[PDB]
Structure 1
Amino acid sequence: LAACTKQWDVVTYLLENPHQPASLEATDSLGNTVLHALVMIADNSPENSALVIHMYDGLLQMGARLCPTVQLEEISNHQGLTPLKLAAKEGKIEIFRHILQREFSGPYQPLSRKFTEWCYGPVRVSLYDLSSVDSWEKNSVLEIIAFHCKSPNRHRMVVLEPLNKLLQEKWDRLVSRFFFNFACYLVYMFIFTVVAYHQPSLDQPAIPSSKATFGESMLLLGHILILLGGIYLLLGQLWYFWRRRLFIWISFMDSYFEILFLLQALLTVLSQVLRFMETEWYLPLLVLSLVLGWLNLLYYTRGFQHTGIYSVMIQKVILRDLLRFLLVYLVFLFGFAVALVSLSREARSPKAPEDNNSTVTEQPTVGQEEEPAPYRSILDASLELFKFTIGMGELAFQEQLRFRGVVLLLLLAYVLLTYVLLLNMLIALMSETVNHVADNSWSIWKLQKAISVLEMENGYWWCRRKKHREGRLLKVGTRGDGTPDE
């Protein structure tokens, strides 16, 4: 706390005491040493930041003079986090920026992290260390920004020069081969949709052969290929689950395509189950697997430049405004939908004292396979009015016979305040998101590039890598001479 209050008179004094030099390497109650005390007390106040940097630097200066020969940053906490890991864990890009910005002009050199060899006035060459990526005995650095993610901000910390430049060159040198992964997956989904398209129209499933020829045998090859890759998707998500332990405990749907992948995989293994039971209903499940995989093609848009920037843009605005427009859509349209199911259709008895729901989700342990929400003999007219509800068919009447003029002006009221007067609302404030997220979408872009890359090499069964000192070219123009004494 003496350092955390800038009090160099009593830091200096509490070292220089007639009884006791202060242990620099010491820890505290949670394990939270002067590293974790200074860092953890430091927030984005630049007065706080500047004091907790320069005061900490003097603690490393007399901290490297009165008691040298002890590497304080080498110490990790009770959680096994270095001050680089903790400062790079609570989302403080300023402090981690100081750690890799650190440069001690005194005896002797290798305290620094930005070295300048083969440097020049116009032509700076800033050499780095990439201990961020060599931290394999603990977690990697994007791992610990990501855990815990975003105490103020998780996406911010990638833009700094080793993480951003490293995440660029690793893609452009290794992980631009991601097109093989998208290539095999794209051929996979083509196989899915051609087996689904060219399926036999016979009622009995598990047909032996439509014809002993190139066609049906090719379809058997497409079937064995398609579940033979589906089991690999299940293996990938189980590595993600046992190894990655995402998703979060009681939290939201984050991340979206993970649980969308889990629901596609669940629905396609139930497809395999009921196909092994050999009934006809394997196919609507197949169309659902189709729309979730062809849906999941946009996960493979993470790669290349204007489309990766574009892909993170749609990832951002689509990831925000998904449920936000859904709570307008499903709820307004369910309410007014029920309003249209009551008006008008005769034979209005699915309910009450009978089975009202017609045993909704009638399939045992398969799901919502029934006639759920049975209508007032307007079940087909109610899926059909729900299909009218995105603007298709029009203008029927019945035994109301235009005494429901109140229902006429009433629909003028709902169509008024909802159809136009509320349709412009969420577009406009997601355009306010566009007014805010646009620069942040670059941070999300470099991040999601670094998750495709970093997670790609982190998963790749069982991968190679390359670990050597970074160096960053700079061609900027400013004066300033001298040397680090050769």
Structure 2
Amino acid sequence: DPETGKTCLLKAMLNLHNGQNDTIALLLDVARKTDSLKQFVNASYTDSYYKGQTALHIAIERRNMTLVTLLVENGADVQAAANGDFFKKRPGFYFGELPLSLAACTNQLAIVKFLLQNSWQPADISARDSVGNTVLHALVEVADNTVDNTKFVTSMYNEILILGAKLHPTLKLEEITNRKGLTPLALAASSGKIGVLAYILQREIHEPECRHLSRKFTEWAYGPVHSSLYDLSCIDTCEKNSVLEVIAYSSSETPNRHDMLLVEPLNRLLQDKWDRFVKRIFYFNFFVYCLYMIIFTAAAYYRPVEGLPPYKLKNTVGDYFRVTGEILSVSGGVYFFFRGIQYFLQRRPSLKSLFVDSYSEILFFVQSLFMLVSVVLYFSQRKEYVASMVFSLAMGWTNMLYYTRGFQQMGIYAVMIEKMILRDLCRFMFVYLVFLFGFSTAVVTLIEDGKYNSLYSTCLELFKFTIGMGDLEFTENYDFKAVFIILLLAYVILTYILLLNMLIALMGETVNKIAQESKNIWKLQRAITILDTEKSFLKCMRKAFRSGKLLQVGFTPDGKDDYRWCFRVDEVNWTT
């Protein structure tokens, strides 16, 4: 047709019954006899919506092996790319644009084997689509972490990897990157494909001539006891995209961000890293922060009470110690200021992650800002520099709760505090503030004088009721007394209804929701701490490898050895 470019062969293939249509063979034979068959069999759509689709794609979609075999036999191009709008990211289905990826993604193993090792035209197992995705990238992409999906995707991945090893022993399929620079493992880690990551990190292939594809090995076996080795290649460090960096520094939109750190090698690796060298550094930093806050508190406590700063120094011991403390406090403030700038520049957030993540950086930065404003006011001959200083002092103590991580119980407790504040208290406070403002305006309107002459004073007086410090004496001689009493009683009853509803709403969340979430959120926080400590590290010596360079196979397909920096785990099984 002139609109789409569809030809007779495509029409015949799209309208076959019971797997058969005699028109196809007649068309192919007539094409063979007329001038040639190559231009006829390789016809394809020209419209943008189904651009590039040809006979092989239709044959694979219908799950008709005979048509696939005949089309390949007749000279159809197995490397035809279907890159229409329907075949990429509205309605559509992305399968990698190629017949080999189409067969792999539809769980048709026979077509995959035929395409790879037919007699006429084998497929290119290392080919890439427009996005740069190979067959394995396509298999990762079509995963949704359900049971049957995980089963078939894992089996197809394993089979294709083994066949690629057999056909091309010198080809490393898993090292091929797409346009974004991601390998299939990095793509799975960044996309939240928990099942594919769990399969890849601990796969065991025990077959001749391809056991080097494994990542989990057995070092030795006694009876119920045995020792296993994990590869850790591109898990700890690879200078481009490690699994730990990708998981830890995600943008919080990944579905399984909390669960991807519970797979067997990563949890033990992070615990080992914590126990090895990070714990002492964390405790040292906590100690230094405590000393800083003590010095700041002591310096602020003994301030002079004269007017119009700056104040002169006397030739006496106390003034020297006081000014030393002030200088140290200012130094700490500017240090935290520059650290906050470094964080913001090195991570480049887009104001969404800061809204839902990384609160501690914001709080420390705000503390430093208050300190700087205090300095500016101090040298400007103002008394208000005290008012800023105390706001930096009080925050300086509450930020100490940051260091509750590194201790499991206090870390879970602090995480629970954080999530309670950010989930339920906001919903409570919105409604409470609406009610308070409404009744405050009503009371100011009713009584125009005598502690209810302003909105601020009335708001404070009504707020006092919420904390059990109210005033219901009714001693004054108001004009609208006995109407005021009704308003106050109604306000009190409604406020206590709201508090009751909040309290009860927080009981429905203790059905084993917050505990399971917190147990993993604390672990993610500790992982971020470990990675940051690794990154800064202030020693300039990178000899602290994590698990030692062991010989794992010693025999690649080539005669060279095989060292992999493996990680040892001991296991015991009494069931044989």
The reply to whether residue 320 of structure 1 matches residue 397 of structure 2 is no
User: 1:340 and 1:205, CA in 2 relative to 1: closer, same or farther beyond 3 A?
Assistant: farther
* Cα distance in 2, alignment partners of residues 276 and 397 from structure 1: 50
Contact 1:268/1:285, CA 8 A, preserved across alignment: yes
Match of 1:38 in 2: 139
* Cα distance in 2, alignment partners of residues 334 and 248 from structure 1: 31
**TM norm structure 1:** 0.84
Greater shift, 81-90 or 67-76, is seen at 67-76
Match of 1:14 in 2: 115
- Unaligned runs of 5+ residues in structure 2 are 1-101, 548-565
Match of 1:429 in 2: 505
Match of 1:80 in 2: 181
Name the amino acid aligned to 2:108.
Answer: Q
Name the amino acid aligned to 1:60.
Answer: L
The reply to whether residue 475 of structure 1 matches residue 552 of structure 2 is no
Name the amino acid aligned to 2:164.
Answer: G
Match of 1:441 in 2: 518
Contact 2:236/2:242, CA 8 A, preserved across alignment: yes
Alignment map for 1:152-231 (pairs within 5 Å): 152-177=255-280, 178-209=282-313, 211-231=314-334
Match of 1:362 in 2: none
Contact 1:89/1:149, CA 8 A, preserved across alignment: no
* Cα distance in 1, alignment partners of residues 392 and 336 from structure 2: 13
1:89-113 per-residue CA deviation (whole Å, 9 max, x = no partner) reads 1112211111111111122433222
The reply to whether residue 138 of structure 1 matches residue 240 of structure 2 is yes
Alignment map for 1:255-270 (pairs within 5 Å): 255-270=358-373
* Cα distance in 2, alignment partners of residues 400 and 378 from structure 1: 20
Contact 1:73/1:82, CA 8 A, preserved across alignment: yes
Contact 2:443/2:458, CA 8 A, preserved across alignment: no
Match of 1:453 in 2: 530
Indicate the SS of the match to 2:415. helix
Q: Shift in Å at residue 251 of structure 1? A: 6.8
User: 1:241 and 1:462, CA in 2 relative to 1: closer, same or farther beyond 3 A?
Assistant: farther
Equivalent of 1:417, from 484, 487, 494?
494
1:109-139 per-residue CA deviation (whole Å, 9 max, x = no partner) reads 3322222213434223221122344334113
Indicate the SS of the match to 1:412. helix
* Cα distance in 2, alignment partners of residues 138 and 37 from structure 1: 21
User: 1:225 and 1:399, CA in 2 relative to 1: closer, same or farther beyond 3 A?
Assistant: same
User: 1:150 and 1:128, CA in 2 relative to 1: closer, same or farther beyond 3 A?
Assistant: farther
* Cα distance in 2, alignment partners of residues 143 and 324 from structure 1: 34
* Cα distance in 2, alignment partners of residues 434 and 88 from structure 1: 31
Alignment map for 1:196-345 (pairs within 5 Å): 196-209=300-313, 211-246=314-349, 248-249=351-352, 252-342=355-445, 344-345=447-448
Q: Shift in Å at residue 249 of structure 1? A: 4.9
The reply to whether residue 96 of structure 1 matches residue 186 of structure 2 is no
Contact 1:248/1:254, CA 8 A, preserved across alignment: no
Name the amino acid aligned to 1:92.
Answer: K
* Cα distance in 2, alignment partners of residues 247 and 296 from structure 1: 24
Contact 2:336/2:365, CA 8 A, preserved across alignment: no
Match of 1:71 in 2: 172
* Cα distance in 1, alignment partners of residues 446 and 299 from structure 2: 43
Indicate the SS of the match to 1:125. strand
Name the amino acid aligned to 2:300.
Answer: A
- Unaligned runs of 5+ residues in structure 1 are 349-374, 480-486
Which fold has the larger relative contact order, with Cα–Cα distance below 8 Å and residues 6 or more apart in sequence?
A: 1
Name the amino acid aligned to 2:220.
Answer: W
* Cα distance in 1, alignment partners of residues 316 and 311 from structure 2: 14
Contact 1:345/1:378, CA 8 A, preserved across alignment: no
Greater shift, 382-391 or 219-228, is seen at 382-391
**Which stretches of structure 1, 4 residues or more, deviate above 6 A after TM superposition?**
none
Name the amino acid aligned to 2:514.
Answer: V
* Cα distance in 1, alignment partners of residues 425 and 241 from structure 2: 33
What percent identity do the matched residue pairs reach?
51
* Cα distance in 1, alignment partners of residues 245 and 367 from structure 2: 27
Match of 1:126 in 2: 228
User: 1:37 and 1:207, CA in 2 relative to 1: closer, same or farther beyond 3 A?
Assistant: same
User: 1:322 and 1:235, CA in 2 relative to 1: closer, same or farther beyond 3 A?
Assistant: farther
User: 1:71 and 1:279, CA in 2 relative to 1: closer, same or farther beyond 3 A?
Assistant: same
Name the amino acid aligned to 1:432.
Answer: G
Q: Which has the larger radius of gyration?
A: 2
Equivalent of 2:124, from 12, 16, 23?
23
* Cα distance in 2, alignment partners of residues 54 and 267 from structure 1: 59
* Cα distance in 1, alignment partners of residues 245 and 350 from structure 2: 15
Match of 1:117 in 2: 219
Q: Shift in Å at residue 428 of structure 1? A: 3.1
User: 1:215 and 1:151, CA in 2 relative to 1: closer, same or farther beyond 3 A?
Assistant: same
Contact 1:4/1:38, CA 8 A, preserved across alignment: yes
Indicate the SS of the match to 1:472. strand
RMSD of Structure 2 on Structure 1 (CA):
2.7
